Amino acid sequence: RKVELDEIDRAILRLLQEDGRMSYSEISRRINVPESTVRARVNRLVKEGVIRKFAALINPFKAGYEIVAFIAVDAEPAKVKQVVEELAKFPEVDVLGIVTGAHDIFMQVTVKDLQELERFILEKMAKIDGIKSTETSILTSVKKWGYARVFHH
Amino acid sequence: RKVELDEIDRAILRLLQEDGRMSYSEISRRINVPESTVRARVNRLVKEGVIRKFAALINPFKAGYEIVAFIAVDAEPAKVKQVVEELAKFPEVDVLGIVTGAHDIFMQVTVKDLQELERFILEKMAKIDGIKSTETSILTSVKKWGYARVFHH
Amino acid sequence: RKVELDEIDRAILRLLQEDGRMSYSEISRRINVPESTVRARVNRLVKEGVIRKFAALINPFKAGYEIVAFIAVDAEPAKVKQVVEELAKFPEVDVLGIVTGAHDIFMQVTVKDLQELERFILEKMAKIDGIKSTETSILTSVKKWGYARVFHH
Amino acid sequence: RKVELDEIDRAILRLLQEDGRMSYSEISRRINVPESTVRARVNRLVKEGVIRKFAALINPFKAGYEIVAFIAVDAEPAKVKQVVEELAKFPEVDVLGIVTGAHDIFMQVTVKDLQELERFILEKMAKIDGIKSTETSILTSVKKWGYARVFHH
Amino acid sequence: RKVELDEIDRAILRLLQEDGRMSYSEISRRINVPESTVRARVNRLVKEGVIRKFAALINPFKAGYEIVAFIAVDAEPAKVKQVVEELAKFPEVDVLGIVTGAHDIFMQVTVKDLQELERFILEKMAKIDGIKSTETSILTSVKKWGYARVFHH
Amino acid sequence: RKVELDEIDRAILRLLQEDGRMSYSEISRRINVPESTVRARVNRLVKEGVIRKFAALINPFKAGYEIVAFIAVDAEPAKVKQVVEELAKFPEVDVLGIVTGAHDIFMQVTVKDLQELERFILEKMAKIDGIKSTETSILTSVKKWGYARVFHH
Amino acid sequence: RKVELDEIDRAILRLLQEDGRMSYSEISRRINVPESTVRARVNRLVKEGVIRKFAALINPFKAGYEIVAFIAVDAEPAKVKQVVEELAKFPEVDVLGIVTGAHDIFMQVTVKDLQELERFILEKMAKIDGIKSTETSILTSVKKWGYARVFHH
Amino acid sequence: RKVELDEIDRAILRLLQEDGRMSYSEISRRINVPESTVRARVNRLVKEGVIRKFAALINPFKAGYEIVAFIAVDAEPAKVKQVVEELAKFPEVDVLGIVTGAHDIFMQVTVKDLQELERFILEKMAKIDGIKSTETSILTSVKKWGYARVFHH
Numbered sequence A, B, C, D, E, F, G, H: 001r002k003v004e005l006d007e008i009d010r011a012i013l014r015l016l017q018e019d020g021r022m023s024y025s026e027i028s029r030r031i032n033v034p035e036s037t038v039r040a041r042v043n044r045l046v047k048e049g050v051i052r053k054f055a056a057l058i059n060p061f062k063a064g065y066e067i068v069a070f071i072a073v074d075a076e077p078a079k080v081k082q083v084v085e086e087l088a089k090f091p092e093v094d095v096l097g098i099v100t101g102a103h104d105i106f107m108q109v110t111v112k113d114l115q116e117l118e119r120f121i122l123e124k125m126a127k128i129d130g131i132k133s134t135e136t137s138i139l140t141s142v143k144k145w146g147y148a149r150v151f152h153h
């Protein structure tokens, strides 16, 4: 699973997290590596899946999403994988995985308001076979943002 | 807090989540809007903070990070804000906020292995005044990735 | 959903929470606004649903109700709305809503004694399809009263 | 503590919960009891504290309050009474009491938005000596309203 | 439900808790009341059910019972009463009732050893329709004994 | 700790749990053992502590106690024994021990009403050094009674 | 169940826990007991089952197992024994028993990595009839090792 | 940390878990490898720490230990490592590590009876600085044994 990375790969990844739209000319000047080996190394990082893709990181509060929430899901053990497959199709779901501990499934969701949160949980998620329970924790403030998939509804 | 957005702004945001390195020429062709109004609208989205920035979205598993975890933190009520300020300085911390529910603080962290996770929790976080308890849930698989800040240690 | 309110509307709402039977003559003298615009503004607040209605606020302990309790209900996710619809028909139920967190449904109930509480939970609520569990917290003292619907059994 | 009530008292209480502004003339016609004994019985109910007072029952969502929440508070056992005394002074707090179970103190609060909820919990409640922990459950919908004290901030 | 008691009744109850085999002659001397009114008052206390009966209070540890445990039972809400009826038939069960809180049913049991505890829980209680879960808390020491029904197996 | 018991001892214990005031004449007739060996065996059971004593078993509901409750206590680990010593002095406390599990101390209490329960928990128990938390479960009905120490306040 | 042991048996057991491959010659010299009575006593300890067997105690981390975890299992009460029988067949399971408390079944498992842990829980354990829930706690460091059954997959 | 192992190493480890006292002559015959390379490979496994040591695996129930328990420990975050260091010195503690989840520290202990368990928890563990809480789960039956360090008190 791990892809071999060297010092130059990590330097490129650091710059492309500073500014995802950085030119390979600018990376080249800053790490004293040829534009050409920069370009080739980025194409390999993408080809290998180290870079899934590039994105605009959106502030959902500024975009008019009032509700960013973490939902902990309890699911029938034999249905956990199928429940994750169904959850992944909703554009409200930003982050989704299977976890150790007291809950089986962990997700982050972004919705416009509390009535949209309740519709999402009770009219969409609750119809998935195998969901026994949900526990929603609503962010009241965010110090460090992750990734929000927004306006895909 | 909400910034006024129209149909064209949302279209641009959708494309810039598809490919964060999309040229304004390419957005212009795809939404039949001038490169020039595309450029001006993106500069306003960034200026207003709707777009925090652009980034490479990294697969931490492929980058050699074996541990992606959610940590729920219980903190002395009067210290919650100060605890968040201290937590935000660690490059292991990808996502960090204050939440409603049974826990006060929610975060995602990315570390190389279980011994790095324990060092992070017991030799870094545990020295913060006001942390009473931590509960770590380790991702065993991720269906939908968020945002990982990686190689900043 | 929000109804537009100005300074005078809020002043009227403050007085009508001080004394729900306050004459529009008395409100008029106290906020130096005409009885006539007071009357018209109250009719609009009621028409718009800002004022649901006026009520006597009853002390259930003084009325002979010994048990004021909060019940947290866990329900099958797909049945939560239908469970709330059935719960709303009981006159024991004063306050009833859907909530984020560890429980799905939150309610306040008022009953005469512990045997009436057990009959309510086990012979009325428990027959509702979709209720998995109830957790009752009994008020031993009330510092600030809400609203009790009483003698409707 | 219980005040002696008869059939006519309960009939009056039922009507004054139907419409808190009902004339004693109207109650008199509906229960075939003299306006005069109606008036005297209501004055005794108020004098005895059975009727705390009359109020407008406000829909906080329509009044522009987006957040109606139940907060469960864990407090140092020796400080529970003093914590309740301090909590009672905030106009955000609608309902407040001491409870049996896993939490010591139960309250309902009404605030304008999530940032006001966090300020209330972390900059007001958290400064009270003896509060160890809070757990907030946010109403996403209300089927049966209680009592909200609003515009007193 | 409450049976009318006076000063002399309470005095008799105090003495009959000091020594359940106390003669009415001895009670008569100690409270300066006639043996005859003592006898008549005890017959009424028994007839009315204030005194369920008299018993030897046994130390189960000294009787060779190593395990005195409290079991909290979670039951399907619609089956709680029937579950209690079935539980009451086992002679291992000393105390049994329905409770407010996180559990539905509370009991104390006395068994000879850990293998008898597991047989009781898994081969007797677990076959009752409606039991979803049990949580056993084993007494490691008893400061104040209640009542143990022993040698009835 | 275990005291040696034979078939006749167990037979006597069974009868003295049927009726704690049973004459040794009556036990003698029912188990075909001499009154004299019956008497000697009971004196040894008491001397050895197998029989702590005899008591009237009281129905607290009929005696006017409305509240029979189980309280789970969380205590500082180093103070658990001292907390039990202090708890044992209250006549409200019927049963008291140290337990395995999520709570340290388990007790049953009997008080007249909810205001007496709150005074007991907050003005008596809460002043004990080392009590961190209490969780009270109130009996709404009792199928099998234990032992209540009553009228000792 | 207990097998009679004397001073010499316990001395032999202490030495055979120091070094499971200790010669009976070496035990004989160290406890000043004949090789022959040492041999006979060890054969009886094995025959009686006091010594289940001898084993190499393996460090799973050094053997390339990255994941040593404790799994708490919640099971339908009537199926707990059958669930344990099925769990015992997996070579990943090192320690397995039935427990008092909030969980029914407790086990330790050893697997190569997080993806093997998830496959074990979701594709093997989850197919067992009667498993309602699992809670995995992953060891981040071990101060005192138990017993790991390794390379049996 | 991982030590390089081949097919022959794993075969030797499998046999030395079957019988920890197996002669290298017997391993040699069973895997068709020279006694001499068997001996050298075992000396390297021990030298590298893959084999911590060899031991008799004892059945504590047969050895007269009635109580095998798992204890979950909650500790002040800054003291977790020091608490583990102190816990490791007790011979009652068989297995001890730091864990992810709701508890910080996990251990297995073996003691003779319930009074020894309470003395261990309250007079030994509870005196360790930083222990906030313990939760003991007692094994009622063991299907698969781990490792018990016994008679070292």
Ligand SMILES: CC[C@H](C)[C@H](N)C(=O)O
Binding pocket: A080, A098, A099, A100, A101, A102, A103, A104, A105, B140, G071, G117, G118, G121, G122, G134, G135, G136, G137
């Ligand atoms: C793979 C983990 C599963 C889903 C569960 N949360 C557990 O801890 O065992």
Ligand SMILES: CC[C@H](C)[C@H](N)C(=O)O
Binding pocket: A140, B080, B098, B099, B100, B101, B102, B103, B104, B105, D071, D117, D118, D121, D122, D134, D135, D136, D137
């Ligand atoms: C702002 C929320 C705080 C931190 C706490 N989690 C609560 O629910 O009340």
Ligand SMILES: CC[C@H](C)[C@H](N)C(=O)O
Binding pocket: A071, A117, A118, A121, A122, A134, A135, A136, A137, C080, C098, C099, C100, C101, C102, C103, C104, C105, D140
């Ligand atoms: C709408 C909320 C639902 C009912 C659940 N309590 C949760 O937190 O996810």
Ligand SMILES: CC[C@H](C)[C@H](N)C(=O)O
Binding pocket: C140, D080, D098, D099, D100, D101, D102, D103, D104, D105, F071, F117, F118, F121, F122, F134, F135, F136, F137
């Ligand atoms: C009066 C009740 C106290 C505050 C606590 N909640 C208990 O159940 O014991």
Ligand SMILES: CC[C@H](C)[C@H](N)C(=O)O
Binding pocket: C071, C117, C118, C121, C122, C134, C135, C136, C137, E080, E098, E099, E100, E101, E102, E103, E104, E105, F140
């Ligand atoms: C009657 C009480 C029921 C059984 C449940 N324990 C509750 O608290 O609501």
Ligand SMILES: CC[C@H](C)[C@H](N)C(=O)O
Binding pocket: E140, F080, F098, F099, F100, F101, F102, F103, F104, F105, H071, H117, H118, H121, H122, H134, H135, H136, H137
């Ligand atoms: C003796 C038991 C202590 C008090 C705690 N309840 C535990 O389970 O470990």
Ligand SMILES: CC[C@H](C)[C@H](N)C(=O)O
Binding pocket: E071, E117, E118, E121, E122, E134, E135, E136, E137, G080, G098, G099, G100, G101, G102, G103, G104, G105, H140
């Ligand atoms: C035998 C114990 C069962 C499985 C459950 N854990 C209880 O505590 O009652």
Ligand SMILES: CC[C@H](C)[C@H](N)C(=O)O
Binding pocket: B071, B117, B118, B121, B122, B134, B135, B136, B137, G140, H080, H098, H099, H100, H101, H102, H103, H104, H105
């Ligand atoms: C290293 C883990 C710590 C001790 C805690 N149990 C947590 O999950 O975060």
